[PDB]
Design a protein around this ligand. Structure first.
Ligand SMILES: Cc1ncc(COP(=O)(O)O)c(CNC[C@@H](C)OP(=O)(O)O)c1O
Ligand SMILES: Cc1ncc(COP(=O)(O)O)c(CNC[C@@H](C)OP(=O)(O)O)c1O
Ligand SMILES: [Cl-]
Ligand SMILES: [Cl-]
Ligand SMILES: [Cl-]
Ligand SMILES: [Cl-]
Ligand SMILES: [Cl-]
Ligand SMILES: [Cl-]
Ligand code: NA
Lengths: 333, 333
């Protein structure tokens, strides 16, 4: 069975009742206040995506991610290039994953016959690891390695022909943590960027890969022609060239609202990012179920029974709705 | 180097001059008159695509393709599941492709180490062929096998555990040719459907797979979560439930316009579908180049130097623009 990711409002409503639009979905890390849609000309809807449409999105992404001249490859969601890591990871070597983290990396790689080593820090890394994977900042804990630590990991693995993959899906709010500007100088470094979370348009399937040209050419060939939609490439070019400072500011305001609601309910926050909070509670799974009975979806983890990941609400009313559900919740037994 | 597919207006304009919007693109088989966009609610843009959004598109596609109860799997363009045929095609067996045809099948499968046999009819098919691929009606010749011939091919290959793939990307105009209703009864039959060509929204990346549940479950796992965008699934549900009779009627009117322009220019039409024409001319490659100098893009083929595939123009003015370019063209030497 596939991983039960956040966002499962359809399945939650079927089990707990209510209309999907009446649920408060706090089970993802998506910006709850989507940016206004830019114009998408009819040409972008009608035609197979043109090289010019691709190139403009790549140029905007290079400026936006500060890639020091590397033109990022647009991909139809970073999930699509996660599915392709078996073709890149050095054959007959282990993969080390800084965890616990987003589950698709281990799922995809183990399904392809790779041996996956769960690690918590760099001192566990060896020459047996053909690929090292860091989600930075981490999903779901928010742990952030400094760029210098990431580059030291890369340099150490490079000696044995190992690669370092840094998934910066949740890194837009802290661009000073990014190593997306180091692809050419490091040589063995790959960076995934995700478009949906920060901009709040996760209905679009769009990410970007920053890497050396031989690696980008490989991903491009594996994905095949017309991999990313015309509308997605049009929208990302416009939004990345707009005022992203105001996007970050709005997110931090909603994060302050979530902090106040969770702290005021007596919950213990142990980590997170601008876009979600990790709560630790001895009955986290029962909290998740009781919140579902209030038609509020949050994210629980089968590997961490005391963990609850709570995303941002869209406004102060939603903050208050969360707080009231916690305050009026029935016995946790 | 990747195949030079039709649609390369960016590259054509850079070589031959002109602004891309001033070119007449007759190098694809896309409906030149895109349907009006249905409403796409903000929810569909904002959220990761929900199971309910997927299921509604699958139900609409089952009705639209007349799949006899099979719910088609939405995929982000049929190119995405072509890239995945190596995982489905029986290992250590040959693949037979009815050709000459769309080039990505042989490109993908040979890159994966499969032996590909080009065939022209069923009498060349043997038990050595683990997979047989028919594009029906064919791109670029328009050749159409009858459903009974396709099912006879399927039944014959089934005896040796062989599969039959029918790509009906260009089949919407002739639904009576489709075998999309035979997945359950045939058992070894897979059908690809493409959304962009008939509806004229090729900026969206959307197709559908009709097959038995074990095969659909395999494709779904290989593609991973959230493979198809929210907007694409919203738009296809609405358009498939609308008046598609009027879409077909408009296409045939533009096809009549193209026929008149090509016949009146003295060109020999040797095949096609409602959405494109195959012309045979002893200097086809030079015709393509001269049309480019008039900023009209058509499709030539490196394997067939006397073939020229011409797509529909958007209106009668474009028909006349094509005719005038042929009439005023300089020496073909
Ligand atoms: C770290 C990370 N990397 C990549 C992706 C893929 O995003 P995209 O394909 O849109 O670029 C996700 C999505 N994570 C989505 C989230 C709902 O899943 P969980 O509840 O399992 O954490 C992610 O969390
Ligand atoms: C027969 C066939 N099957 C599948 C596809 C893929 O379409 P989609 O991914 O949108 O479902 C195409 C696209 N063919 C597009 C065309 C421009 O390519 P050529 O000039 O090489 O024929 C096709 O012609
Ligand atoms: Cl109810
Ligand atoms: Cl998320
Ligand atoms: Cl830069
Ligand atoms: Cl010019
Ligand atoms: Cl086409
Ligand atoms: Cl039916
Ligand atoms: Na889209």
């Amino acid at each position: 069975a596939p991983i039960v990711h956040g966002g499962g409002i359809t399945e939650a409503a079927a089990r707990y009742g209510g209309r999907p639009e009446d649920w408060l979905d706090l089970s993802t890390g998506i910006n709850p206040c989507p940016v206004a849609l830019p114009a998408v000309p009819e040409r972008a809807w009608h035609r197979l995506p043109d090289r010019q449409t691709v190139d403009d999105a790549r140029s905007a992404a290079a400026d936006y991610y500060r890639t020091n001249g590397v033109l990022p490859l647009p991909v139809p969601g970073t999930q699509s290039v996660i599915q392709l890591l078996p073709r890149l990871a050095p054959a007959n070597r282990h993969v080390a994953i800084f965890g616990p983290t987003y589950g698709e990396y281990a799922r995809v790689l183990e399904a392809a016959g790779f041996a996956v080593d769960r690690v918590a820090d760099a001192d566990a890394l060896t020459a047996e690891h053909g690929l090292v994977i860091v989600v930075n900042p981490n999903n779901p804990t928010g742990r952030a390695l400094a760029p210098a630590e990431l580059l030291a990991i890369a340099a150490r693995q490079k000696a044995s022909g190992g690669l370092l993959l840094v998934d910066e899906a949740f890194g837009d709010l802290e661009p000073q943590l990014s190593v997306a500007g180091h692809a050419s100088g490091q040589g063995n470094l790959i960076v995934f960027r995700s478009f949906g979370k920060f901009f709040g348009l996760a209905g679009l399937r769009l990410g970007f890969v920053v890497a050396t040209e031989p690696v980008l050419a490989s991903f491009a060939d594996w994905l095949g022609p017309w991999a990313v939609s015309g509308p997605a490439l049009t929208i990302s070019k416009a939004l990345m060239q707009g005022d992203t400072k105001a996007i970050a500011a709005g997110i931090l305001e909603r994060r302050a609202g979530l902090d106040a609601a969770l702290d005021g309910a007596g919950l213990n926050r142990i980590g997170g990012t601008g876009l979600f909070v990790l709560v630790e509670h001895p009955r986290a799974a029962l909290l998740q179920e009781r919140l579902c009975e209030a038609h509020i979806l949050t994210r629980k983890f089968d590997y961490a029974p005391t963990w609850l990941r709570v995303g941002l609400a869209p406004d102060a009313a939603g903050d208050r709705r969360l707080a009231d559900a916690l305050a009026r919740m029935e016995l946790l037994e």
